[PDB]
Amino acid sequence: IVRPVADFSPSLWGDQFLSFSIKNQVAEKYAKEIEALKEQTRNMLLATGMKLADTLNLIDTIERLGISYHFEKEIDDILDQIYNQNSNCNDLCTSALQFRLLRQHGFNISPEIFSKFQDENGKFKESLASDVLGLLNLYEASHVRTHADDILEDALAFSTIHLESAAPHLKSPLREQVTHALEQCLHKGVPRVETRFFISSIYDKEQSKNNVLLRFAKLDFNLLQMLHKQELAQVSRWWKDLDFVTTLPYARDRVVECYFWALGVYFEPQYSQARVMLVKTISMISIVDDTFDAYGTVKELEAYTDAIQRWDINEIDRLPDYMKISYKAILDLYKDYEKELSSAGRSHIVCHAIERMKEVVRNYNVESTWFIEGYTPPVSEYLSNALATTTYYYLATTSYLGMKSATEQDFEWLSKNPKILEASVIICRVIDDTATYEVEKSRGQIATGIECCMRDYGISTKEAMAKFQNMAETAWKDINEGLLRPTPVSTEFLTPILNLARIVEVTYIHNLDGYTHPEKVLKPHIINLLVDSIKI
Ligand SMILES: O=S(=O)(O)C[C@@H](O)CN1CCOCC1
Ligand SMILES: [Mg+2]
Ligand SMILES: [Mg+2]
């Protein structure tokens, strides 16, 4: 058997993450000061007699600074009061911010708040084009709409054209904030990534910045970063002790990038165990993906797929040696998970992720069959297989394993493929298909998403790309609607699904596969989040 020649770029990180020794004196010093700053900030939030605009701006700043996870109760209380008081009497910047913050927190505020800013036709009043702060907040708000918000249909185009026009003449850091927002809106960004940018490039440079908030944000970011580096060290050692870099050299070596993905799903300290479990799964399924895509023969992949369905160490002998390596590692990893969850009495929940993994692998094998047979399915059939091969049903399920509050009912809800999950999966599918269409076409993949779309509807590549873009827009509206109260499960179990969608947007920004080629996009994020501390 002649295997195809390897082509993936090596890990660009070497061993620079393998050993991190926390400075406990510095960590304890940061924690002690943060306790004081946290209380000062709580008192700011609880201050009586604040105007609506000031209250919304304070909450917005605390959220962008990445320290709002300390104040979930306080912020919820305040937004709930604002939601139920229904003050519709403010300028564009306050109205748009009010709308965004409430919707992001699940409060279903009416989009009629924008009617006063529009003419008879429902188009935004062009007289608003000289209000830059209003336009910026309208821009950010436009990204949180649902299918019930067609009154905002014009908001993105309107805010964008006039922000672009205004930008070159704006003072700093407002200019940089506007320019950044046009590249990456807040709602669809990865939270730590946007937080790092906001602290260092914007708030640190604001003449009017609150010094207590800025110091709090910097110390908290850097303290959490120490935990993340410990986790990544622990994960780097685990990966090193598996040595797939040598024994499975056909596979993408990307455990740092996998860690960045897990960090995007949740960054908070209470999700430490969850992050570490999640990154191990992402790493391991990536090995399997490359095994199906770029090494295994038809016959091997069949045996591998069946072995995964039976999930039994007895089955290793049916596999070639190189497949024995990944197969044992997979079984062992899930045994690791079981032991890791044993003292909490949550071992039994591991079966949910295992069943999702089997699903991914069945559909990997279908994809391989289609490729060999030269089959181009209709779009409906394509999606019935290719949605699971995003791994996103699987990763969302995995994200719950380490979450201490996840119950059987939460897994049961997820198992039914709820709308918000389906939407996140679709976003991953269509954005990846758009970014990778050309290269996969070159590699002979006749069953690529765009190709299936072209043949099915009888339309150009351009038109198919556009249809896929529409599917993504529909899915984002479904995600936003999925966050609205009453939620079917606690919001805590929705945010990982939202964040998986965000990771798609961030990783394939500018229509490129950032996981396979991390140099352009992921490398700067990894450096900013996991290498460089924020200077104080
Ligand atoms: O080819 S897709 O299925 O469109 C995208 C997936 O390959 C992404 N991997 C990267 C690492 O996490 C698991 C999935
Ligand atoms: Mg693949
Ligand atoms: Mg692909």
Describe this structure in words.
- The chain has 536 residues and is an all-alpha fold.
- The protein folds into two domains: 5-48 and 209-535, Farnesyl Diphosphate Synthase; 49-208, Alpha/alpha barrel (Glycosyltransferase).
- It is built from 23 helices and no strands.
- Helix 1 (24-45) crosses helix 9 (211-240).
- The N and C termini lie far apart (58 Å).
- It binds (2S)-2-hydroxy-3-(morpholin-4-yl)propane-1-sulfonic acid (6BX) and magnesium ion (2 copies).
- Residues 282, 285-286, 289, 389-391, 432, 515 line the site of (2S)-2-hydroxy-3-(morpholin-4-yl)propane-1-sulfonic acid.
- One magnesium ion is lined by residues 289, 293.
- Mg(2+) 2 binds at residues 289, 293.
- InterPro entries: Isoprenoid_synthase_dom_sf (IPR008949), Terpene_cyclase_plant_C1 (IPR044814), Terpene_synth_N (IPR001906), Terpene_synth_N_sf (IPR036965), Terpene_synthase-like (IPR050148), Terpene_synthase_metal-bd (IPR005630), Terpenoid_cyclase/PrenylTrfase (IPR008930).
- Pathway: Secondary metabolite biosynthesis; terpenoid biosynthesis.
